Design a protein around this ligand. Structure first.
Ligand SMILES: Cc1ccc(-c2ccc3ncc4c(c3n2)n(C2CCN(C(=O)[C@H](C)O)CC2)c(=O)n4C)cn1
Length: 830
């Protein structure tokens, strides 16, 4: 068509990369996957209830926690309804369904419509108890009234989707390399499967010059018939300067034959990029390498006591404890006993010699007998581990994905960020995981909204993986709907203009500066910007006009914008603005990863009726060293609370914070809250920050609210260029204690710590796989391997709870002993 040739022009502005281009490819895998995805998209589209998908309730089926029942008086919750300007409060039992709340409104008063939340694009539709809606649970948690404005349901029609239509050893010739500019140099060629190295050959050292030829045949000691699907020819160049990869078996199961001229990635300064099947786009600068392939089809007893226990002691250890050869042979030989334990599956499948046809054969035999796995309750940590870089076999990976299909929307959103990062571990573009994320993001607008920005973030700052991601996004967009498709267009229009203002103001560096900013913010507020837009980190909110008066640039080398917006929705029960920081220079990708692990930890604590009161504030990476950050209301930096009444000195006073807190409390009662709120929040971050190894931080990078909530910021600043945590004399002061001593609050502190710390240890393996995946996909440079193992030590694995409660309280003590040494040390950092 012609429209459809322009429709693709919009997608390409939404995606941020051109997926029709075919100039940095060397085969039809991408078109093949774009093509392959057409089906699961239309498949999912045709299956979503059009209504429930237009109104996208945000529900959970988990149990309403204790701390929120004990915040309810008596099976009685209050929902303040709004029609016009009339109010009316009503009684509700936590078990009252939203649909039956109208059989209590068109009947419970006399002398069609659906309940929408005031100020937000959030509804309470569908057959759920209201105690189970997230918004309700958020209003309960922070002591707030539930305001709904009854009105007309959106029209599914606006969601409508636009209409569719041999024993021969393997060998490879290294013709030679060539860099358009500069030593001795040789080529390494490895056959890899899941970080496992099947064979390795080399070249003769040639003289490092702008061109180098070899015309050699490197014969491998692997039979053609023993190549497993998903095996990579991995080509590298030492003097290690460059790598590139090529799948030996292809998306159509063909042995790869022909000539290839592959352009190569440079090292700099382990991680996920190094695994990509993508060649460099930058053909002008990139060293390349030329090669040639011509060579096609593709195809229980008992146990000694000591052995069983030796096997038991293997199954039990954490995901990072290395497997010896003796360990592996033992898992393999007793594989059938090993299959009875879902916990065994990562290590058992790491015992497989994947370079051997017949072994792989038996492994698939093993997978066919999968009932104990199939029948076991979903364990996400177990499941994440089969999706990491250690597994290249499709059938193994796909049984992990099968296990994820049972996640309800709530939990998909907890792990969405890292499931999307996990795509980098997929050997091929079309996978069960890439299709799984398609389905869940086509079924649910909140998942799909977030999926858009996660994918879009990667496309804009990763050339290693943008193509694969581009293809997944396109497939998403062709199924989200015109409504959302238009809503996504509003959003990108806005954040591209603001990024522009962001980078511009940044270069201009002040007295003058404050002038320009306000002036550019005057332009955009005409007929270039639309009237409003969903805040990307909180799809619930629509931002209207820029409170120009309130906007500003900030003191900070790289100089972020402090923007504020009016809520674009009239039914908004207040006139508080929406506050966003736009910033360049920080790797906000790392911040996303840490923030989301924080939400997971909050969630692990919920399982055990704890609320450690963290503030994982919204954060969306939009490009390389650029993105936006949600503003927390009524907050200041801890430093600043010191700079207030000691002023830019370092002469740290122990009394200031408990003063500032009383200085900000409306009463003495609300003051105690701010002290209740503080001791929890302080311990929440102390534990969480210590586990991740980002607890040794600087005074300026920690904040509090005029109501007691502590929370860390800037997590890129450490994991991004890099005492146990931070439990300082000022913090302890609010906790009643001084120097060396004790008090009722401080002990409470310690009891909340030890509970929280222990509660995370219950989920050791989960945390470890998440930490481990984070470093590989999001911490460039910071891998080493011996970075990974930190969280092993941190979570004090192998130790008893008793040894555990101990170790943490001691970690706490290094906080009393050091006092100010470090904060002052960080200050003295000029
Ligand atoms: C990487 C990174 C950057 C910013 C933030 C961040 C997050 C929430 C904030 N809320 C209020 C507030 C902030 C905030 N800064 N800020 C600052 C903190 C310091 N800052 C930085 O960029 C630090 C120095 O790197 C600018 C934003 C405020 O002033 N207020 C009131 C988190 N991570």
């Amino acid at each position: 068509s012609e429209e459809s040739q322009a429709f693709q022009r919009q997608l390409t502005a939404l995606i941020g990369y051109d997926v029709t281009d075919v100039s940095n490819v060397h085969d039809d895998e991408l078109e093949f996957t774009r093509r392959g995805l057409v089906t699961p998209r239309m498949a999912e589209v045709a299956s979503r209830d059009p209504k429930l998908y237009a109104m996208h309730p945000w529900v959970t089926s988990k149990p309403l926690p204790e701390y929120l029942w004990k915040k309810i008086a008596n099976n009685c919750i209050f929902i303040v309804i709004h029609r016009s300007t009339t109010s009316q409060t009503i009684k509700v039992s936590p078990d009252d369904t939203p649909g039956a709340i109208l059989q209590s409104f068109f009947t419970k008063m006399a002398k069609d419509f659906v309940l929408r939340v005031c100020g937000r694009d959030e509804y309470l539709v569908g057959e759920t108890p209201i105690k189970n809606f997230q918004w309700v649970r958020h209003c309960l948690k922070n002591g707030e009234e539930i305001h709904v404005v009854l009105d007309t349901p959106p029209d599914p029609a606006l969601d409508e989707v636009r209409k569719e239509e041999c024993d021969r050893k393997f060998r490879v010739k290294i013709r030679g390399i060539d860099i358009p500019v500069l030593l001795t140099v040789f080529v390494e060629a490895n056959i890899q499967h899941g970080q496992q190295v099947l064979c390795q050959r080399r070249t003769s050292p040639k003289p490092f010059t702008e061109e180098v030829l070899w015309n050699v045949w490197l014969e491998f000691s692997i039979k053609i018939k023993d190549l497993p699907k998903g095996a990579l020819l991995n080509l590298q160049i030492y003097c290690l300067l460059y790598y590139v990869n090529l799948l030996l078996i292809d998306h159509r199961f063909l042995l790869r034959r022909g000539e290839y001229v592959l352009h190569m990635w440079q090292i700099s300064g382990f991680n996920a990029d190094k695994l990509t099947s993508a060649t460099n786009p930058d053909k002008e600068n990139s060293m390349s390498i030329s090669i040639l392939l011509d060579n096609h089809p593709i195809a229980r007893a008992e146990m000694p006591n000591q052995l069983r226990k030796q096997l038991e002691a293997i199954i039990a250890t954490d995901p990072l404890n290395p497997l010896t050869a003796e360990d592996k042979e033992l898992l393999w030989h007793f594989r059938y006993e090993s299959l009875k334990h879902p916990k065994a599956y990562p290590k058992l499948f790491s015992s497989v010699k994947w370079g051997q046809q017949e072994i792989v054969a038996k492994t698939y035999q093993l997978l066919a007998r999968r009932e104990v796995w199939d029948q076991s309750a979903l364990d996400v940590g177990l499941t994440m581990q089969l999706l990491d870089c250690n597994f290249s076999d499709e059938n193994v990976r796909a049984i992990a994905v099968q296990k994820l299909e049972s996640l309800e929307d709530d939990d998909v959103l907890h792990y969405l960020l890292q499931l999307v990062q996990a795509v980098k571990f997929e050997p091929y573009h079309d996978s069960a995981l890439a299709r799984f994320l398609l389905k869940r993001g086509l079924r649910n607008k909140r998942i799909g909204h977030f999926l858009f920005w996660f994918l879009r973030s990667e496309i804009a700052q990763s050339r290693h993986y943008q193509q694969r991601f581009a293809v997944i996004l396109e497939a998403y967009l062709r199924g989200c709907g015109t409504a959302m498709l238009h809503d996504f267009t509003q959003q990108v229009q806005v954040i591209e203009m603001l990024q522009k203002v962001t980078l511009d103001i940044k270069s201009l560096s002040s007295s003058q500066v404050i002038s320009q900013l306000k002036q550019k913010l005057e332009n955009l507020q005409n007929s270039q910007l639309p009237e409003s837009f969903r805040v990307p980190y909180d799809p619930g909110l629509k931002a209207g006009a820029l409170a120009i008066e309130k906007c500003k640039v900030m003191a900070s080398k790289k100089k972020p914008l402090w923007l504020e917006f009016k809520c674009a929705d009239p039914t908004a029960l207040s006139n508080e603005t929406i506050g966003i920081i736009f910033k360049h220079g920080d790797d906000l990708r790392q911040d996303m990863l840490i923030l989301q692990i924080l939400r997971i930890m909050e969630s692990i604590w919920e399982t055990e009726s704890l609320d450690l009161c963290l503030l994982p504030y919204g954060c969306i990476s939009t490009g390389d060293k650029i993105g936006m950050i949600e503003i927390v209301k009524d907050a200041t930096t801890i430093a600043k609370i010191q700079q207030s009444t000691v002023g830019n000195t370092g002469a740290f006073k122990d009394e200031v914070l408990n003063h500032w807190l009383k200085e900000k409390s409306p009463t003495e009662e609300k003051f105690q809250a701010a002290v209740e709120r503080f001791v929890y929040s302080c311990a929440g971050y102390c534990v969480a920050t210590f586990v991740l190894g980002i607890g040794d931080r600087h005074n300026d990078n920690i904040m509090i609210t005029e109501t007691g909530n502590l929370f860390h910021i800037d997590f890129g600043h450490i994991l991004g260029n890099y005492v146990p945590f931070v439990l300082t004399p000022d913090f302890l002061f609010v906790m009643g204690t001084s120097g060396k001593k004790t008090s009722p609050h401080f002990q409470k502190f310690q009891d909340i710590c030890v509970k929280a710390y222990l509660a995370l240890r219950h989920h050791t393996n989960l945390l470890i796989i998440l930490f481990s995946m984070m470093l590989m996909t999001g911490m460039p440079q910071l891998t080493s391997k011996e970075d990974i193992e930190y969280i092993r030590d941190a979570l004090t694995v192998g130790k008893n709870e008793e040894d555990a409660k101990k170790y943490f309280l001691d970690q706490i003590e290094v906080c009393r002993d050091k006092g100010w040494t470090v904060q002052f040390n960080w200050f003295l950092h000029l």
